[PDB]
Design a protein around this ligand. Structure first.
Ligand SMILES: O=C(O)Cn1nc(C(F)(F)F)c2c1CCCC2
Length: 167
C-alpha cells in the first residue's frame, strides 16, 4: 500500500490522475518526483518551471552546481538530485523536445530511467511544452516502465481523453 489517492488504474503498474504535479508532490511527499528536464537543467516553465518555483529556486541553484561539475545531460538521460520540499528525490529526466527536432525514439530511452525506481510520481515525458503527442507518450510509458508510476496530467481535456482513448 502507498499514499497515492484518486488515481485511475491503467495497467498492473501504471496509474493516472488529473492533477497539478506540484500540488500532488506537496500533498504526498513521494520518494521520487520526476521532472520534465532539459539537458541544461534550466527549469523555466511547464513542469520544471513549476517544480522549481515551488522550491523557491533551490532546485535551480542545485541544478546549476550539478551542471558546472558534470556538464549537460543526454537527451534520454537523467540524474537524481534532491526533491527539496516536494519529495525525497527528484529524478530529472530529459525526454526529446520535438520543438528542437529531437528523435522521438529517445522517448523510450527517457522512460527507461523510471525502472531504476520502485515508485514514482511523474508527468508524461515530452508532453506540454516539449511538443510530443501525449497519447503516444502514455503508450510508451505503459510499454516501457515496469515499476509503479503515478502519472499527473495537467490538462483536464487531456486527462479525460487519455483515459477515454487508452487501449
Ligand atoms: O497536460 C499535461 O500534463 C501537459 N500537456 N500536454 C499537452 C499536449 F497535448 F501534449 F500538448 C498539453 C498539456 C497542458 C496544456 C494543454 C496541452
Amino acid at each position: 500500500v502507498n499514499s497515492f489517492s484518486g488515481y485511475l488504474k491503467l495497467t498492473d503498474n501504471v496509474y493516472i490522475k488529473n492533477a497539478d504535479i506540484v500540488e500532488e508532490a506537496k500533498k504526498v511527499k513521494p520518494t521520487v518526483v520526476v521532472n520534465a528536464a532539459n539537458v541544461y537543467l534550466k527549469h523555466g516553465g511547464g513542469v520544471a518551471g513549476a517544480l522549481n518555483k515551488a522550491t523557491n529556486n533551490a532546485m535551480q541553484v542545485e541544478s546549476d552546481d550539478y551542471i558546472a561539475t558534470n556538464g549537460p545531460l543526454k537527451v534520454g538521460g537523467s540524474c537524481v538530485l534532491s526533491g527539496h520540499n516536494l519529495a525525497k528525490h527528484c529524478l530529472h529526466v530529459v525526454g526529446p523536445n520535438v520543438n528542437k527536432g529531437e528523435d522521438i525514439q529517445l522517448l523510450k530511452s527517457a522512460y527507461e530511467n523510471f525502472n531504476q525506481h520502485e515508485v514514482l510520481l511523474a508527468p508524461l515525458l515530452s508532453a506540454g511544452i516539449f511538443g510530443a503527442d501525449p497519447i503516444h507518450s502514455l503508450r510508451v510509458c505503459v510499454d516501457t516502465v515496469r515499476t509503479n508510476v503515478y502519472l499527473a496530467v495537467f490538462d483536464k481535456n487531456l486527462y479525460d481523453k487519455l483515459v477515454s482513448s487508452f487501449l
